């Protein structure tokens, strides 16, 4: 109940669309207590089945062959994080060993265990297999909040699918629930934007078509400088009230040196390895 309830109320959220995708669950234990009730509340598109993802007959029942993606949830409160991530990697290799081409999304409790996930020969992040490391993102959101307070709640509100809620009283909740109503979305830029600099299309798409643009696929960059002009076929990341609103970004066409200061690639500052007695 404490793991599926936050997942279900976002996946089956009314504001995205009225589509049917999620229809099956599997686990070695029976779904006793206040959990079958949460399945009753979604009867037409949940269907729990009893079986273990380590067994290829149970993978064959739930039709892993054409299951689109598999989602693996971690026990966030477990006594041994490294045993959990090894266990969930056993599930990943079980699923990939049964079927090469299913997409897999998995929670990892520790950062280092994401290396092990890259050893599997049938895993490729270039085709949308990925791991959500909870320690990496948790401590990362806190770290960026040390640069700007409130950023960790800003980011956490950009993923969760939420509708706009109207408030009539002039309290702080009125302006907050307006800002909560948007999500991170992405779309390919219209050919009308090709050949001109990123700040200029940001000002155009904010002013004329009410979309905030953040980043572009120059593999993946964030708020690129005024010297960077847009190529054809670039993906462009947006903040918007709803997915149907980002479509205008595509449909628009005029109309209306002797010492080591850094790590080996210059991404981070670095120093020679200190002794702990030097920093206590």
């Amino acid at each position: 109940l404490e793991s599926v309830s936050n997942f279900l109320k976002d996946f089956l959220h009314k504001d995205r669309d009225d589509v049917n995708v999620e229809i099956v669950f599997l686990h070695n234990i029976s779904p006793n207590l206040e959990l079958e009730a949460l399945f009753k509340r979604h009867f037409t598109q949940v269907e729990f089945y009893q079986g273990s993802v380590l067994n290829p007959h149970d993978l064959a029942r739930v039709k892993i062959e054409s299951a689109d993606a598999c989602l693996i949830l971690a026990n966030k409160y477990c006594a041994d994080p490294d045993a959990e991530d090894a266990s969930n990697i056993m599930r990943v290799i079980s699923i990939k060993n049964y079927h090469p081409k299913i997409r897999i999304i998995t929670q990892m409790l520790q950062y280092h265990n994401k290396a092990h996930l890259l050893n599997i020969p049938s895993w490729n992040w270039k085709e949308g297999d990925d791991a959500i490391c909870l320690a990496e993102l948790k401590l990362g959101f806190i770290a960026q909040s040390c640069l700007a307070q409130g950023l960790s709640t800003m980011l956490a509100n950009l993923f969760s699918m939420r509708s706009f809620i109207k408030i009539e009283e002039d309290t702080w909740q009125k302006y907050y629930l307006e800002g909560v109503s948007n999500e991170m979305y992405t779309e390919y830029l219209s050919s009308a934007f090709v050949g001109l600099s990123f700040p200029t299309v940001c000002e155009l798409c904010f002013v004329k078509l009410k979309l905030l643009m953040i980043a572009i696929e120059s593999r993946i960059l964030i708020n690129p400088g005024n010297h960077l002009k847009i190529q054809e076929g670039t993906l462009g990341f947006f903040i918007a009230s709803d997915a149907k609103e980002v479509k205008r970004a595509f449909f628009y066409c005029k109309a209306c040196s002797n010492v080591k200061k850094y790590d080996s690639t210059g991404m981070f500052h670095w120093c020679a390895p200190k002794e702990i007695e030097k920093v206590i």
């Binding site: 090894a86 060993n97 599997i120 049938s122």
Partner: protein, 315 residues
């Protein structure tokens, strides 16, 4: 050794033993791994060097059992570390052995073999200035059903007995459950366990059992003509069918002719072949995996790629 010492030590043709182990964990009994590799049938230059990679805390309470064998080293580390595997030249060994002491501390069928499966995958995925998928590995499994995770170009099914599976047929997995039929084999014929013991232990005699039972350690002795005559046993070896004395018969020619000449000219007595998994196909393949043929039936063809299992004389 520290990593730097292992890295400048030119380890090649050696054995790497990867141990998952800890101060709480039971003794594996590593003397039994080292002794067959220290038989006086080998010349001192023919001895494969042995490196243990694992917790030193664990090795520290076993090593006095194997502190009288010559070519042995330890790297304090973890088999999941690419840096440790590089420091011991894992691309150059004749075998990597993967063991776990933690077999008995949780029983959940999944939880028993995680480390060994991650370790073997971590060695397979390596890159060197070649991929690591060609490296010889043998993995001890606590649950023979977990063998399905060791390979991915195989076919897996929960009702298959271990002996049919690709990683077992290729000689890359072992499970103590395959010895369960040694009970029934030894009831019906008492001589079998005597043969297995002499063939496998490095020929330990009843006199050796008595000396070890008294003194609890292997005790060194000075040379004598009888101590030297005791070296003249056979030893198991693999012969490559690309060498001059046999390659002319490795053209599709008969195993029986190879057996007859190798026996009569060298006393070599071959007893099986290790054939490439794909050698029956018309297409070439990149697959380096071999599988075991025991007692080939005469009139049986030798492809030049085959390795011969044989018993060869001392000199």
């Amino acid at each position: 050794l520290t990593r730097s010492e292992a890295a400048m030590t030119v380890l090649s043709g050696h054995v790497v033993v990867c141990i998952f182990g800890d101060v709480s964990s039971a003794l594996i009994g590593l003397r039994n791994l080292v002794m067959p590799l220290r038989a006086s049938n080998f010349h001192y230059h023919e001895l494969k060097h042995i490196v243990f990679v694992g917790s030193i805390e664990y090795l520290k309470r076993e090593w006095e059992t194997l502190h009288n064998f010559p070519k042995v080293s330890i790297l304090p580390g973890t088999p999941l570390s690419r840096a440790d595997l590089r420091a011991v030249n894992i691309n150059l060994c004749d075998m990597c052995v993967i063991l776990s002491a933690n077999q008995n501390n949780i029983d959940d069928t999944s939880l028993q073999d995680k480390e060994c499966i991650l370790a073997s995958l971590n060695i397979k995925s390596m890159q060197f200035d070649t991929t690591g998928v060609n490296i010889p590995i043998i993995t001890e499994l606590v649950n023979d059903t977990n063998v399905q995770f060791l390979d991915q170009d195989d076919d897996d099914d929960p009702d298959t007995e271990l002996y049919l599976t690709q990683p077992f047929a290729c000689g890359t997995a072992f499970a103590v459950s395959v010895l369960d039929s040694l009970m029934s084999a030894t009831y019906f014929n008492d001589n079998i366990l005597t043969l297995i013991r002499t063939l496998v232990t490095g020929g330990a005699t009843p006199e050796l059992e008595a000396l070890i039972a008294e003194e609890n350690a292997l005790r060194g002795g000075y040379s004598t003509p009888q101590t030297l005559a005791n070296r003249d046993r056979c030893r198991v070896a693999q012969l490559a069918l690309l060498d001059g004395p046999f390659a002319d018969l490795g053209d599709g020619g008969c195993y029986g002719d190879l057996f007859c000449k190798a026996l009569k000219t060298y006393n070599m007595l071959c007893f099986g072949i290790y054939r490439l998994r794909d050698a029956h196909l018309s297409t070439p393949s990149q697959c380096t995996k071999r599988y075991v043929i025991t007692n080939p039936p005469y009139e049986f063809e030798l492809v030049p790629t085959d390795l011969i299992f044989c018993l060869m004389q001392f000199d």
